[PDB]
Amino acid sequence: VQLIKNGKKITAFVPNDGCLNFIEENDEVLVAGFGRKGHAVGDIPGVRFKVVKVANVSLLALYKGKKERPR
C-alpha cells in the first residue's frame, strides 16, 4: 500500500480466510498496527501493520455476511 499523506510504502497483513478477495486493487484501505507497537509479530517478518476497513465497511461484516460490497 502507498499512503495518502506521505506517499511512502507500507506492507500490511490481511486477516481471516477469504478476506483477500474483498480487497480489490487500486482502492483505498485503512491500516493499523498489530499490537506490539513497533516490532514484527508472529512468524511473519517484514510486516508491522494490518488492515481493518476497505471502504467504510469492516472486514468483519464482509466476512460474516451481514453486509455486502457497496459497488
Partner: protein, 595 residues
C-alpha cells in the same frame, strides 16, 4: 459519495525544471496504467480524467503548486428531497426562499427547477426518499428540523403564506380554462394595480378584444396581469419570458420587480442572456445530468453567479466539467464550392387583412439555395401571412404558389396524437440522407433514443420543440417555414441545434423562413434580412428586403435598445435602457461590433 480528479495547468507549470515528481510518485502510474503522462518537454504535463482514483498524493509533493484537486458531481443517496419512483428523476435540495429580494434560479433543461417550485408551492409535497408512506404535516417537519424550513412550512399550513405560480406552458390552457372578454379580467378582482399592470405591460390594445383573436403577446400579457392582480402572499414566475418581444420582456421584468420589497418571497426562472441582472438579486445555480439527477448549489450574487454558470465550470466550492462558450456561435467558418445554378423567383407585394389588422407585404428576392429572417415586434403580422400564402384563406388579388413541397414549421405546438412518438415517426422516414442527420442535432452528450420513446403528453418544452424541429426535415419537402425554434431552449441546446439546421438546409440545396426573437439566435442564422415594421392591431409593413446589418439597425433604431460585445469571449450583453455609452452606439447607429 462524490467524485475526485486532478487538474494541471498553471502559471509556469514547468515540466522542464521539476524533474517530474507527479509521474515518479503517483500510485496509478506504478501499477501499469499511465494516468499521468509527462517527459522533459516544451508542453504541459498531461493527466487523464477517467483513471484518477482521487488520492491527492501528487499534489502534496509536486515541487510547484501547479496541480489542484477537483471533485466531480455524483449521486450518493444524500438529502433526497423527492423521487417519483425508480429509474426516474430525483432532486436533493430545495433551498432558502429569502424574502425582500427575488430569487433567480438559473440550470440546463430537464434539471428539476419546475419541480422545486411545485414543492415550494405546497402542491406536490416532497417524498423524500421514499414511497411516500410518511406524509403528514409532521415527519417532514421533523426531518428538516434545526433549520429554517420548519418556520416556512408551519406558516404555509396554516396557509399564512398563500401560493400562486405562473405555469410553465401556455397550451393546455388556452384549452383547459375559458375566458369572458372584458368581464373576465374585470370580475377577476380589483383596481389600481391591474391598471398599473395592464398599462405598464405596454399593451393598450386588447381592452375591447376577444381572447381567441390574440396570440403569444396578448396571452402572456393577460396571464401575468391576472397573476399579479391575484391577492396572495407568495409568488412564483416559471418561465415568464418565453416568446415575447425584446422591448416587452424588459417591461415584464420590472412589473415582476414591483412586488418584492415588504417581507415577501418571490421565485423566478429563466434561461437568460444578460437580462437576469434586472430579474433577480440572488442567483442560484442547478447542476447534474438532464433527466437523471439534479443538485441545487447555494445562492450567489447575480454578477458573480452569471459568469460562473456560463464560464464553463466554477467550483471551489465543489466542481464539475463542461460549460463554456455558447452565448453565440463562435463557429468560425464559411465558404463553399461554386453554387450552380440558382434562380430569382419573386414573391409579390400582397395586401392582406383579417378584421382589426391591415397587413402589407413588399416585393422581394427569394433566392435559391439560400436564409430569410422575420421579426420584428410581436403582432407585426408574420405567421398568419405564411398560412395565407400556402392555403387557408386568401387572396383577393394575386399570389405565387410554392414550386417546392413545403415543410411546416409551426409555432403553436401543443399536439395531440395518442399512442407514442415512434408511431408518428413512421409518417416521416428514417432512411434518406441516413448518415447521422437527427443524430447530428443530438445523440452523444444530452441523449435522445432520448426523443423516442415515451409519451408526447409528458414531454418537456425543449424536447417537445425538438419533436417539431424533426417534423420539418422529415416529410419530403424543401422550402421551410419555421416560427420560433428558440421557444423553450437555452443557450446550450439552441445555438448548436440552430447551426445544425442551417447546415442541413444550405448544404443539400434548400431556403428557410426563420422567425427568431433570439441576438445570437437571429444573427447566426441570418442573411436578408427582411424587417417587419408598424404598430400592433393597426398596420404591418414588411420592409423591402435589405442588408443583416441594415435590417437589424432598422429594428433597433425604433426601439430604442442596444447590445455590447463581451470582449474576451465574443458574447452579447444587453444595455440598461438609457446609459452613457448607450449614446455612442445610438449615434454610430452601430449595435454590433466585430464581424
Amino acid at each position: 459519495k462524490l467524485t475526485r480528479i486532478a487538474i494541471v495547468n498553471h502559471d509556469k507549470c514547468k515540466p522542464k525544471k521539476c524533474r517530474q515528481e507527479c509521474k515518479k510518485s503517483c500510485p496509478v502510474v506504478r501499477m501499469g496504467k499511465l494516468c499521468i503522462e509527462v517527459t522533459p518537454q516544451s508542453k504541459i504535463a498531461w493527466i487523464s480524467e477517467t483513471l484518477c482514483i482521487g488520492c491527492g498524493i501528487c499534489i502534496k509533493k509536486c515541487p510547484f503548486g501547479a496541480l489542484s484537486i477537483v471533485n466531480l458531481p455524483s449521486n450518493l443517496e444524500k438529502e433526497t428531497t423527492h423521487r417519483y419512483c425508480a429509474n426516474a428523476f430525483k432532486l436533493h435540495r430545495l433551498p432558502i426562499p429569502r424574502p425582500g429580494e427575488v430569487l433567480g434560479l438559473v440550470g440546463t433543461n430537464g434539471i428539476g427547477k419546475s419541480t422545486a417550485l411545485k414543492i415550494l408551492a405546497g402542491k406536490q409535497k416532497p417524498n423524500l426518499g421514499k414511497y411516500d408512506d410518511p406524509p403528514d404535516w409532521q415527519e417532514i417537519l421533523t426531518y428538516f428540523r434545526g433549520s429554517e424550513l420548519q418556520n416556512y412550512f408551519t406558516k404555509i399550513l396554516e396557509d399564512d403564506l398563500k401560493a400562486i405560480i405562473k405555469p410553465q406552458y401556455v397550451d393546455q390552457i388556452p384549452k383547459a380554462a375559458k375566458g369572458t372578454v372584458g368581464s373576465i379580467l374585470d370580475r377577476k378582482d380589483e383596481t389600481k394595480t391591474q391598471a398599473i399592470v395592464c398599462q405598464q405591460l405596454d399593451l393598450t390594445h386588447l381592452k375591447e378584444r376577444n381572447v381567441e383573436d390574440l396570440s403569444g403577446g396578448e396571452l402572456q400579457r393577460f396571464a401575468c396581469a391576472v397573476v399579479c392582480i391575484q391577492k396572495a402572499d407568495i409568488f412564483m414566475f416559471d418561465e415568464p419570458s418565453s416568446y415575447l418581444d425584446v422591448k416587452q420582456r424588459l417591461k415584464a421584468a420590472i412589473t415582476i420587480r414591483s412586488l418584492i420589497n415588504p417581507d415577501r418571497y418571490i421565485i423566478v426562472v429563466e434561461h437568460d442572456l444578460s437580462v437576469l441582472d434586472y430579474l433577480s438579486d440572488f442567483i442560484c445555480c442547478l447542476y447534474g445530468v438532464p433527466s437523471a439527477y439534479g443538485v441545487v448549489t447555494m445562492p450567489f450574487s447575480v454578477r458573480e453567479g452569471i459568469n460562473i454558470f456560463l464560464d464553463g465550470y466554477v467550483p471551489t466550492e465543489n466542481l464539475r466539467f463542461r460549460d463554456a462558450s455558447l452565448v453565440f456561435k463562435v463557429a468560425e467558418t464559411a465558404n463553399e464550392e461554386e453554387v450552380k445554378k440558382m434562380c430569382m423567383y419573386k414573391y409579390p407585394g400582397m395586401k392582406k387583412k383579417m378584421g382589426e389588422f391591415e397587413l402589407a407585404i413588399v416585393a422581394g428576392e427569394f433566392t435559391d439555395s439560400e436564409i430569410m429572417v422575420m421579426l420584428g415586434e410581436n403582432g407585426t403580422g408574420k405567421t398568419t401571412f405564411i398560412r395565407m400564402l400556402a392555403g387557408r384563406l386568401k387572396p383577393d388579388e394575386g399570389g405565387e404558389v410554392p414550386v417546392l413541397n413545403v415543410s411546416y414549421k409551426p409555432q403553436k405546438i401543443s399536439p395531440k396524437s395518442t399512442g407514442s412518438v415512434r408511431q408518428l415517426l413512421h409518417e416521416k422516414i428514417r432512411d434518406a440522407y441516413t448518415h447521422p442527420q437527427f443524430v447530428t442535432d443530438v445523440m452523444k452528450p444530452l441523449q435522445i433514443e432520448n426523443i423516442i420513446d415515451q409519451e408526447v403528453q409528458t414531454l418537456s418544452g425543449g424536447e417537445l420543440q425538438r419533436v417539431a424541429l424533426a417534423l420539418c426535415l422529415g416529410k419530403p419537402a424543401d422550402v421551410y417555414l419555421i416560427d420560433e425554434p428558440s421557444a423553450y431552449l437555452d443557450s446550450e441546446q439552441r445555438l448548436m441545434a440552430a447551426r445544425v439546421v442551417k447546415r442541413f438546409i444550405l448544404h443539400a440545396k434548400k431556403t428557410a423562413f426563420v422567425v427568431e426573437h433570439d441576438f445570437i439566435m437571429a444573427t447566426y442564422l441570418a442573411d436578408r434580412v427582411i424587417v417587419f415594421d408598424g404598430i400592433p392591431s393597426k398596420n404591418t409593413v414588411a420592409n423591402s428586403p435589405q442588408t443583416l446589418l441594415a435590417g437589424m439597425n432598422k429594428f433597433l433604431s425604433q426601439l430604442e435598445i442596444t447590445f455590447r460585445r463581451d470582449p474576451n469571449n465574443y458574447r452579447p450583453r444587453i444595455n440598461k435602457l438609457n446609459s452613457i455609452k448607450d449614446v455612442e452606439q445610438k449615434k454610430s447607429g452601430n449595435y454590433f461590433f466585430l464581424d
